[PDB]
Design an enzyme around this catalytic site. Structure first.
Site, PDB file in Angstrom:
ATOM      1  N   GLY A  23       0.980  -1.315  -0.126  1.00 47.28           N
ATOM      2  CA  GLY A  23      -0.035  -0.193  -0.017  1.00 47.28           C
ATOM      3  C   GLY A  23       0.781   1.287   0.048  1.00 47.28           C
ATOM      4  O   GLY A  23       2.052   1.159  -0.116  1.00 47.28           O
ATOM      5  N   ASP A 179     -11.666   1.139   6.377  1.00 53.66           N
ATOM      6  CA  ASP A 179     -10.918   0.766   5.121  1.00 53.66           C
ATOM      7  C   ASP A 179     -10.903  -0.585   4.485  1.00 53.66           C
ATOM      8  O   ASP A 179     -10.027  -1.347   4.194  1.00 53.66           O
ATOM      9  CB  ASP A 179      -9.405   1.289   5.217  1.00 53.66           C
ATOM     10  CG  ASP A 179      -8.755   1.397   3.996  1.00 53.66           C
ATOM     11  OD1 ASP A 179      -9.350   1.659   2.953  1.00 53.66           O
ATOM     12  OD2 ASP A 179      -7.606   1.342   3.713  1.00 53.66           O
ATOM     13  N   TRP A 182     -11.475  -5.025  -0.573  1.00 54.59           N
ATOM     14  CA  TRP A 182     -11.275  -6.656  -0.637  1.00 54.59           C
ATOM     15  C   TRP A 182      -9.822  -6.891  -0.687  1.00 54.59           C
ATOM     16  O   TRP A 182      -9.546  -7.989  -0.669  1.00 54.59           O
ATOM     17  CB  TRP A 182     -12.098  -7.170  -1.855  1.00 54.59           C
ATOM     18  CG  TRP A 182     -11.893  -6.519  -3.346  1.00 54.59           C
ATOM     19  CD1 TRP A 182     -10.902  -5.475  -3.667  1.00 54.59           C
ATOM     20  CD2 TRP A 182     -12.102  -7.151  -4.566  1.00 54.59           C
ATOM     21  NE1 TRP A 182     -10.711  -5.302  -4.796  1.00 54.59           N
ATOM     22  CE2 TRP A 182     -11.614  -6.355  -5.504  1.00 54.59           C
ATOM     23  CE3 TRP A 182     -12.973  -8.174  -4.848  1.00 54.59           C
ATOM     24  CZ2 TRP A 182     -11.939  -6.660  -6.982  1.00 54.59           C
ATOM     25  CZ3 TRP A 182     -13.265  -8.397  -5.963  1.00 54.59           C
ATOM     26  CH2 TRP A 182     -12.772  -7.579  -7.086  1.00 54.59           C
ATOM     27  N   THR A 219      -4.851   0.594   9.558  1.00 58.60           N
ATOM     28  CA  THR A 219      -4.239   1.864   9.196  1.00 58.60           C
ATOM     29  C   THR A 219      -5.422   3.037   9.497  1.00 58.60           C
ATOM     30  O   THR A 219      -4.938   4.087   9.956  1.00 58.60           O
ATOM     31  CB  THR A 219      -3.895   2.026   7.781  1.00 58.60           C
ATOM     32  OG1 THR A 219      -3.296   0.750   7.351  1.00 58.60           O
ATOM     33  CG2 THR A 219      -2.871   3.021   7.618  1.00 58.60           C
TER      34      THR A 219
END
Ligand SMILES: Nc1cccc(-c2cnn3ccc(Nc4cccc(Cl)c4)nc23)c1
Ligand code: NI
Length: 328
Positions: A23, A179, A182, A219
Site C-alpha cells: 500500500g 478501510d 477487498w 491503518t
C-alpha cells in the site's frame, strides 16, 4: 532504541521472504518464523524522503494502528466477545537500517509478476527507521481470490463471517475498520465445518464453506476502551475523499458524510457501508466455479441481492447480524 534489521529478519528469514502485498504505507512479505508462516508489514517512519507519493508518518502517527492491532489480536482468546475473525499480532519492532537487498529481490519479483504502484524501496539510508509488524499468516486476500470461490454459498459464508467479526468488535471495542476494501479481507482454507463466535455472552456458529475469513490492516481504524478513543484522524486528508473508478472511493465520502468529518466519534454505520461495498464486489466482480444455473444458487443470489438492497437501512454490523434475514 531501534534494533538492526538483522534482529527481526536474520538471513534465513530474509531468504524465505516473498512479497505478498503493498500500500502507500509500505510493503507486506510472507516468510517463516520458527517453522511457522508469518506476514510482515514494514513501514518507513520519521524520514525526510517522499515514499510512494507521500511524506512518511511519524511514530506517533503509526501508534494507533499498533494499538488497534494489539486490541484486535486479543479477541480470539476472549470470552464474552470472542472471534477468530481478525488476525494475531506477534510482535512490533522499531528497526534501523537501509532496506535489505533480499527484500528488494522479493520486491522486484512481485513487480515483475504482479506489478507495483510503489517506489522501489532502495533509497533509504542506514539511519532510516521502520516499524516492522509481524502478524499471524491469514491466507490470501479476497481480491486475488475473486476468481477462486466455489459458489455464492461461499460468498454468503464470507459475508456472515465478516458481519459477525465486525459485530463482536463493535460490542467489545466500539470498532470501525474504516478501510475494508477487498485487499483487507483474507481467506484461508479450513477443515472446520462450523466457525464459532460469541457476542455479549451468546455463542453462535457459521458454516465455514471451507474458509476462515480474517479482517486485516488497521491503518484507518478506530476503537475505544473506557472512553479513550484510538483512531486515524483524516479530517484534513483531502485526497482520501477525491478518489474515482471504484465504489471503494465513494465509501470514504459516505463515511465523512455520516460522521460530519469528526473521526473521533463512533459511527458503526461505516462497517455497514464497507459491508455494502463488499457485497457489491461479490455480486459484480467475482467468478465462481459453480455458475448460476440451479435452484439453490438462484435462491442464495436472490438473498445476497436482497441483502445488498436492504443492508444500508441497518445501523451497525451488530444490527445486521442480529436482525437481517440473510443470517437467520
Ligand atoms: N493487519 C495486517 C496488516 C498487513 C498484513 C496482514 C496479514 C496477515 N496475514 N496476511 C496474509 C496476506 C496478506 N496479504 C495482503 C495483500 C495485500 C495487501 C495487504 Cl496489506 C496484505 N496480509 C496479511 C495483517
Ligand atoms: Ni525483538
Amino acid at each position: 532504541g531501534p534494533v538492526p534489521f538483522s534482529h527481526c529478519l536474520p538471513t534465513e528469514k530474509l531468504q524465505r521472504c516473498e512479497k505478498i502485498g503493498e500500500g502507500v504505507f509500505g510493503e507486506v512479505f510472507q516468510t517463516i518464523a520458527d517453522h511457522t508462516p508469518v506476514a510482515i508489514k514494514i513501514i518507513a517512519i520519521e524520514g525526510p524522503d517522499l515514499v510512494n507519493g507521500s511524506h512518511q508518518k511519524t511514530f506517533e502517527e503509526i501508534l494507533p494502528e499498533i494499538i488497534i492491532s494489539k486490541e484486535l489480536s486479543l479477541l480470539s482468546g476472549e470470552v464474552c466477545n470472542r472471534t477468530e475473525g481478525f488476525i494475531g499480532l506477534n510482535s512490533v519492532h522499531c528497526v534501523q537500517g537501509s532496506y535489505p537487498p533480499l527484500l528488494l529481490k522479493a520486491w522486484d519479483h512481485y513487480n515483475s509478476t504482479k506489478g507495483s504502484a510503489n517506489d522501489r524501496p532502495d533509497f533509504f539510508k542506514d539511519d532510516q527507521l521502520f516499524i516492522v509488524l509481524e502478524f499471524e499468516f491469514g491466507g490470501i486476500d479476497l481480491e486475488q481470490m475473486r476468481t477462486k470461490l466455489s459458489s455464492l454459498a461461499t460468498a454468503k459464508s464470507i459475508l456472515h463471517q465478516l458481519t459477525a467479526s465486525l459485530a463482536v468488535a463493535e460490542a467489545s471495542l466500539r470498532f470501525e475498520h474504516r478501510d475494508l476494501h477487498w485487499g483487507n479481507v483474507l481467506l484461508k482454507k479450513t477443515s472446520l465445518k462450523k466457525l464459532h463466535y460469541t457476542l455479549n455472552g451468546k455463542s453462535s456458529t457459521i458454516p465455514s464453506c471451507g474458509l476462515q475469513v480474517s479482517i486485516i490492516d488497521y491503518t484507518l481504524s478506530r476503537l475505544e476502551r473506557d472512553g479513550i478513543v484510538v483512531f486515524c484522524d483524516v479530517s484534513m486528508d483531502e485526497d482520501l475523499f477525491t478518489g474515482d473508478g471504484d465504489y471503494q472511493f465513494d465509501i470514504y465520502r459516505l463515511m465523512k458524510k455520516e460522521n460530519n468529518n469528526r473521526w473521533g466519534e463512533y459511527h458503526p454505520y461505516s462497517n455497514v457501508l464497507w459491508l455494502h461495498y463488499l457485497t457489491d464486489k461479490m455480486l459484480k466482480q467475482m467468478t465462481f466455479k459453480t455458475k448460476c444455473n440451479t435452484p439453490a444458487m438462484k435462491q442464495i443470489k436472490r438473498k445476497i441481492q436482497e441483502f445488498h438492497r436492504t443492508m444500508l437501512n441497518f445501523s451497525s454490523a451488530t444490527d445486521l447480524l442480529c436482525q437481517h434475514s440473510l443470517f437467520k
